[PDB]
Amino acid sequence: XTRPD
């Protein structure tokens, strides 16, 4: 959830 990218 911290890095969609």
mmCIF file of C-alpha atoms in Angstrom:
data_model
loop_
_atom_site.group_PDB
_atom_site.id
_atom_site.type_symbol
_atom_site.label_atom_id
_atom_site.label_comp_id
_atom_site.label_asym_id
_atom_site.label_seq_id
_atom_site.Cartn_x
_atom_site.Cartn_y
_atom_site.Cartn_z
ATOM 1 C CA UNK A 1 0.000 0.000 0.000
ATOM 2 C CA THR A 2 3.051 2.279 0.303
ATOM 3 C CA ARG A 3 4.240 2.094 -3.325
ATOM 4 C CA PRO A 4 1.538 1.606 -6.002
ATOM 5 C CA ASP A 5 4.213 2.680 -8.505
#
